[PDB]
Structures are given as structure tokens and as C-alpha cells.
């Protein structure tokens, strides 16, 4: 399942927390997956080690 992140503002930043320890992660540039207010929402896939942003309302 994938894990609950944030996302920072346009200055493209995400936080993830895992079991145990938590860590960063980043996320692209694209228009489509950037964040237009910190704290938005944010994902992090372990399986492909890929990190994708979103937001919404």
C-alpha cells in the first residue's frame, strides 16, 4: 500500500514516514505532479522507488 507523504511548496519537497525511521523524498517538477502550497499531497512508491506529488481543493 502505498505510503502517506507530504509535499513542499513549488520549491518541489516531500516528507514520507516509514516503520521505524522516517525519511525524504522528492518529487518532479511537472506542472501536473508540482505542489502549489506546502503541505500538500504527496505519495511514495517503495516497489519502483518512485516518488509522485498531487493536490487538490
Do not use: M
Given at each position: 500500500l502505498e505510503y502517506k507523504g507530504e509535499c513542499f511548496t513549488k520549491d518541489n519537497t516531500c516528507k514520507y514516514k516509514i516503520d521505524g525511521k522516517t525519511y525524504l523524498a522528492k518529487c518532479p517538477s511537472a506542472a501536473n505532479t508540482?505542489?502549489?502550497?506546502?503541505?500538500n499531497k504527496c505519495t511514495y512508491d517503495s516497489y519502483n522507488r518512485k516518488v509522485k506529488c498531487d493536490f487538490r481543493h
Amino acid at each position: 500500500l502505498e505510503y502517506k507523504g507530504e509535499c513542499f511548496t513549488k520549491d518541489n519537497t516531500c516528507k514520507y514516514k516509514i516503520d521505524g525511521k522516517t525519511y525524504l523524498a522528492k518529487c518532479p517538477s511537472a506542472a501536473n505532479t508540482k505542489c502549489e502550497k506546502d503541505g500538500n499531497k504527496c505519495t511514495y512508491d517503495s516497489y519502483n522507488r518512485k516518488v509522485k506529488c498531487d493536490f487538490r481543493h
